[PDB]
RNA sequence: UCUGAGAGUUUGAUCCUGGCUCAGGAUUAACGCUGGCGGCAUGCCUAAUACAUGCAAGUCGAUCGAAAGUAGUAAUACUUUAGAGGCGAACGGGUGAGUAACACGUAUCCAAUCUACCUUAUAAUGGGGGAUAACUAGUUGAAAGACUAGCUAAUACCGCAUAAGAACUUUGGUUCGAAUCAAAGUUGAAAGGACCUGCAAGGGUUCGUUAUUUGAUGAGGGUGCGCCAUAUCAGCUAGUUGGUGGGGUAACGGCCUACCAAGGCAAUGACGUGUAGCUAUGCUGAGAAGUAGAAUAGCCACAAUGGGACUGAGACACGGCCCAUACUCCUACGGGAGGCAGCAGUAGGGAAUUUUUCACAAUGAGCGAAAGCUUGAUGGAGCAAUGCCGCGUGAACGAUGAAGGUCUUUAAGAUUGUAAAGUUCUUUUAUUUGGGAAGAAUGACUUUAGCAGGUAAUGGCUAGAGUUUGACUGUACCAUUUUGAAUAAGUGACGACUAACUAUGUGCCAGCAGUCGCGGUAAUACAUAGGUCGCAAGCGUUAUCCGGAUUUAUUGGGCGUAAAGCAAGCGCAGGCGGAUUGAAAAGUCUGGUGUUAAAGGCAGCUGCUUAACAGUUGUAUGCAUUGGAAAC
RNA sequence: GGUCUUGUAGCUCAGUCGGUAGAGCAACGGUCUGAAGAACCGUGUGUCGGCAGUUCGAUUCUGCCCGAGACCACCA
């Protein structure tokens, strides 16, 4: 929302990125990447992967496992 | 808009006229006593100001410091 | 008024119309909670005459509670 | 959680019996296998003193078989007196509607007697009571709520109901009271306070 | 407040067939001016109907819309159906809308294909015999080939199953009636009359729950989102909770307020051209042209079984037979819903004509009900024609 | 009398130092998954961005001419008011941009102050003048309106006089910068409306009148203090400093003016500069304190921007006025019109923060004899799992345990699991039925009974009789009021941290991850599945604060080899000071007094079907004053 | 709803006015290497967003539709 750009992980299994796509972000320090304490909601929005996220999707929020 | 809003613009005006002249009908007095000295313009000075002195036109303490000033500087003459 | 949503109550105080209220009190006279049309106001008594004697309509419920001691009766020859 | 659903799925793992023995005995065995296939052979995977404290706090809060909203509130409230808060608590933990009502020899479970406060049929002191979680102090009155009667559960229950040594009661009304304050004697010395009020770091 | 009316007027909605240089806008406000006299408050719109520019300047219908001309026994709101190929939609719509109609076929601008595919689409969704005015005979006033008009206009009604030798066809120009000369002005009466049979009035119902066709959508200063449209079936009033469906998630939503031509109304009935500003909905989330339900109704449904029969070149159809893969779009009413003709087993290549029995499924879950009559076209032609048999989901 | 939680992690391991991380609470919280209900409190922080509409201020005709209307042939009577006059208009409502200061307070000086109304008390309620509003006639412009000439009311406005008492002068006396008193001088007060009693004359009722006297009320100023970061901010202030005079404020004041001079501020921080509504308070803590100064409250600032003036008791006034500015709109293109930081509502923003709702029933306000009036204040209703709370989603029984998911890597048996089918049993909610409160021991209304000055009437006051105005209410609630398990459970985790294992697949790929860490070939970790576990009508994570962290240490540190002793000396200001004698008691302890509102802290109690919340009382702290001590 | 751009492989692009679907990389196998990188390469990878006409199988000549996207739809 302000003019920063600023680089972040792709949480979730797949990609749906489209170069330019609106992401709802998340922060969140990975050690993995130097410094890098951002990521994504995949989930809600144009991006839409995540297949069977049937462990925990109040993080990369999808429809309820149907049972 | 409160509804007594240009019924008191069209009647605050004849007030405003009336504080307007009644001043001045005392400050042409002031000046006399300022061209001449004498106790009976005094006199006129304090009944022409006794009028607005009663009402808010002229400050009643502010009025009564002026004449204390008028009486003290005529009596040092 | 002042309390609790649903439960409606009115404490007693001598306020002036320059406040709003739930501002600052100048002096609560007891309290009253119309929660219970019995018995549920109390006042201090003696503020009443004085307060009273020096003018300064406090709040038009004072009148009613008068009402209840008939204070007039008791007050008219010291005020005439 | 309101409720507790199963309850030997607790007995297994907290080694629990309100009835002392037979919250899991003689259901063609009394079995101390382990909820889930997993009880091979185990001592302690991470069970300590935070675990049995745990343990303890699942123990004596589905015993009765409460929310935890409720019991922590009711433990900042007797925050709020003085006195060794621990046994006053227990005793208060113990005074409440429910636990009053299964111990007056008229409710077969706990979950009985919620279930009986809350379809209104208890009464107490001439109040409906729609929610049990009063705490209860000497000189009430409970009472049978006599248009219900016809439940046949309760009928059984009450003629040989178990009646607690601090409230009494009689079938030939169906009413009772709390009579006096309990004593610790009358509760197992298996529980201990120590754990519960001690395991409090939250609050 | 935006100036509560108090429905007394009865409404009986009628519309327009035909194309522009028949007099179109001069007839639309010749109406109204006529009809004002006689009966009151009949609101007149000749260039003020048109509000945006190639409206203003070309004068043409993009955007269609209504107006309203009540008397003093009855209340009548118009639609202005388009021709102008490729606006066939715009008038489909119109048609969605419809119980009666005023056929505008002049004597100079005569019947061309465009009104002839008009005039099938309004057959084949089923209109109750539509009542026929013979336009512009003040300039060319015929004799022959007046009676040239009128029958093929009604060889034209003929053809597609119509009484066309009973179709009442009132002659005259409502030009030379709006310009004061009452010869032409009591051909307008003669016109109404015919209306007042076979062009029925509508039963405000309290019985069924709900359904709006969406015509526009609107948003005003300061309220919020209106959309407007003709309330088909169901009672309604300020305070009800209504459900965008089709095309959407099925959405609860709260009514703010009910009007009809942005003035608030009694209540909303059963054929009551209405709308309705909502609370807390979108005007991006609304399309114009879109469904409506309320819960506990009708559900939308993708993939339907009915008989159809195809478009006949001989009466204006396909020229060449559809294929299975063949993706025509459907008609409920508001939308140009696609979806494959995916025809029964052993018949893959199907020529026009020929009613048969055939499954298709949709790509959006339109709310589907028996005895519903639907037109299908394609490629800028109707190229289908049936009603639904079962729903099978 | 009063309160105390830990853990891992440097490396080969270890001891020491040490940061970091986590386990925990709170949020205008949104978001993610999911979601029955009620009580309860709050609900736009962003763009102090613009904003149709309504309403946010109207009321008084018993203050007035006059207008219109109706009952009346009239006479008139009555209703309202086009308008004048009066009252309130400055209460209130909401946004903290701004201001780092007498702003907020605190304790106080106002011998430096006023104070519409309202209280106490004293004197009367005179005679005149001039009128115009309203209106009539007309032009012009779309209106904004103005002007040309007439016509009448008031308690509208203004002379004259009486003016006790006042105020201002002169003079006299009077006590500790003030003030009372004796005399005179100057000058100043109004009003009528309705009405009883009257043949009338008049007396008078009642509202008010003026000069008055008492108050309080509020306002304002000032003092000492307290509360940001900041000297990689050392000179700053020319009305600034002091003095004289004058002008202006309710009061005094370089508040201002002209003159005479150069002083005033600051290294113990003038000021430079970034940010800021302050406080009570809310979260954490054992504490001081850190946190934010949510929601409300006290106070203060402003009203599109910048000035300015009227009136009024006070305003330059959110919704009054002029100008200029900017926007917007209308336009006859010449000129006019508007200020939701008033409530809801819309557009832009944000991830988002309730309805363009009902009643003025109740509180409260004023305007009014009264009647009656309005009241986006207020009470409500509705939206949001916004937060807490209450509460269901069935009870018991039911066996070596139905099928079946899995396992032991199959055939047992176990787990799921009393889980199940099922025996009945049932309803707070749900569902039909009728009843049903209180809130209105409000206020006035009318008569009755009684009281008092006053009598010849009244009028004023007190008790009872009735009418009442209920928004919510159909509320809460209940009688098998009819039926009914029916109306309702998800979420996350299961390696150690920090409670929660098996199978498959996968092979440092996918991805999980605060830590270590897992998958380059049998993953407790990753994806999924079964089982287990934990919180639940909510669960988790996000982001901020706090705890843990006693980790800049009053509580609560060290300066040898982990940061830390200056390279040393001289040494100003300053900090720290031998013993004995005396004084005061400044500081200090301490008792009493006033204040630090209230809410909120605490304890009891009460309504809260139980708690949330609200109310009852008591309930500290700091400052000032006063009585004690010399221990220091 | 229309004024118009656009969807070609897994992705990006080339493709006489109808004769024909391919490059670069994602990425499978060989050469490969003590093992690993590097490595040269052969693939598979499409009726061209989906449908209706025309004829020489139509991205190719057009039209229609689905979706995204530069204008107009209370709107003085």
Not at chain 4, 126 to 148: C, E, F, M, Q, Y
Not at chain 5, 58 to 81: F, L, Q, W
Request: proline letters at 4%.
């Amino acid at each position: 929302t302000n003019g920063f750009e600023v680089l972040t992980y792709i949480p979730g299994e797949g990609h749906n990125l489209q170069e330019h796509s609106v992401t709802l972000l998340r922060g969140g320090r990975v050690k993995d990447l130097p410094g890098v304490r951002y990521h994504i909601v995949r989930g809600t929005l144009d991006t839409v992967g995540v297949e069977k996220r049937r462990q925990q999707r109040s993080a990369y929020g999808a429809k309820k496992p149907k049972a | 808009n409160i509804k007594s809003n240009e019924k008191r613009l069209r009647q605050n005006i004849k007030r405003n006229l009336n504080n307007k002249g009644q001043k001045t009908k005392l400050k042409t007095n002031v000046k006399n006593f300022h061209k001449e000295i004498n106790l009976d313009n005094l006199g006129n000075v304090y009944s022409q100001a006794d009028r607005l002195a009663r009402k808010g036109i002229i400050s009643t303490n502010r009025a009564r410091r002026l004449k204390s000033r008028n009486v003290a500087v005529l009596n040092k003459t | 008024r002042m309390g609790r949503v649903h439960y409606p109550t009115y404490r007693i105080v001598a306020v002036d119309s320059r406040v709003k209220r739930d501002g600052k009190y100048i002096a609560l006279i007891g309290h009253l909670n119309p929660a219970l049309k019995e018995n549920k106001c109390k006042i201090d008594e003696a503020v009443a005459l004085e307060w009273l004697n020096k003018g300064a309509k406090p709040t038009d419920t004072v009148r009613s509670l008068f009402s209840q001691t008939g204070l007039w009766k008791k007050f008219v020859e010291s005020k005439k | 959680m309101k409720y507790t659903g199963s309850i030997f799925k607790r007995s297994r793992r907290l080694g629990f019996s309100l009835l002392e023995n037979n919250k899991e005995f003689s259901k063609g065995k009394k079995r101390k296998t382990i909820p889930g296939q997993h009880g091979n052979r185990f001592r302690s995977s991470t069970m300590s003193g935070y675990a049995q404290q745990l343990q303890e706090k699942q123990r004596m809060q589905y015993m009765y078989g409460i929310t935890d909203k409720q019991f922590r509130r009711l433990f900042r409230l007797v925050l709020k007196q003085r006195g060794n808060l621990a046994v006053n608590l227990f005793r208060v933990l113990e005074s409440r509607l429910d636990n009053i009502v299964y111990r007056m020899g008229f409710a077969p479970t706990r979950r009985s007697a919620r279930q009986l406060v809350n379809h209104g049929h208890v009464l107490l002191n001439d109040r409906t009571v729609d929610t049990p979680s009063i705490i209860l102090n000497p000189g009430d009155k409970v009472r049978l709520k006599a248009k219900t009667i016809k439940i046949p559960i309760v009928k059984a229950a009450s003629e040989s109901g178990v009646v607690s040594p601090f409230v009494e009661t009689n079938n030939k009304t169906f009413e009772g009271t709390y009579v006096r304050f309990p004593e610790r004697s009358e509760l197992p010395a298996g529980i201990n306070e120590s754990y519960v009020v001690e395991w409090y770091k939250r609050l | 407040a935006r100036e509560k009316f108090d429905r007394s007027k009865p409404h009986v909605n009628v519309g327009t067939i035909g194309h522009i240089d028949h007099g179109k806008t001069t007839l639309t406000a010749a109406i109204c001016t006529v009809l004002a006299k006689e009966g009151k408050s009949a609101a007149t719109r000749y260039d003020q109907i048109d509000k945006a520019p190639e409206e203003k300047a070309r004068g043409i219908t993009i955007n269609s819309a209504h107006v309203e001309y009540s008397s003093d026994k009855r209340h009548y709101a118009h639609v202005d159906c388009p021709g102008h190929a490729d606006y066939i939609k715009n008038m489909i719509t119109g048609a969605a809308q419809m119980d009666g109609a005023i056929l505008v076929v002049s004597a100079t601008d005569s019947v061309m294909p465009q009104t002839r595919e008009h005039i099938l689409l309004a057959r084949q969704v089923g209109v109750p015999r539509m009542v026929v005015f013979l336009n512009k005979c003040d300039i060319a006033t015929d004799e022959e080939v007046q009676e040239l008009v009128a029958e093929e206009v009604r060889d034209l009604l003929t053809s597609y199953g119509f009484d066309g030798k009973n179709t009442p066809i009132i002659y005259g120009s409502a030009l030379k009636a709006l310009e004061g000369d009452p010869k032409w002005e009591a051909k307008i009466h003669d016109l109404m009359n015919a209306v007042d049979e076979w062009i029925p009035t509508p039963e405000r119902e309290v019985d069924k729950p709900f359904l709006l066709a969406i015509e526009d959508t609107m948003t005003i200063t300061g309220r919020g989102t209106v959309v407007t449209g003709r309330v088909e079936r169901g009672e309604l009033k300020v305070g009800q909770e209504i459900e965008i469906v089709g095309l959407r998630p099925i959405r609860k939503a709260v009514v703010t307020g009910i009007e009809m031509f942005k003035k608030e109304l009694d209540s909303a009935m059963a054929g009551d051209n209405a709308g309705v500003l909502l609370r807390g909905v979108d005007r991006k989330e609304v399309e114009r042209g879109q469904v409506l339900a309320k819960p506990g109704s009708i559900k939308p449904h993708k993939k339907f079984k009915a008989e159809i029969y195809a478009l006949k070149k001989e009466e204006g159809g396909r020229h060449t037979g559809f294929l299975n893969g063949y993706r025509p779009q459907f008609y409920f009413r508001t939308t140009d819903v696609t979806g494959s003709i995916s025809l029964p087993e052993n018949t893959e290549m199907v020529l026009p004509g020929d009613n048969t029995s055939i499954t298709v499924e949709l790509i959006a879950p339109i709310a589907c009900e028996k005895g519903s009559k639907f037109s299908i076209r394609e490629g800028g032609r109707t190229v289908g024609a049936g009603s639904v048999t079962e729903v099978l989901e």
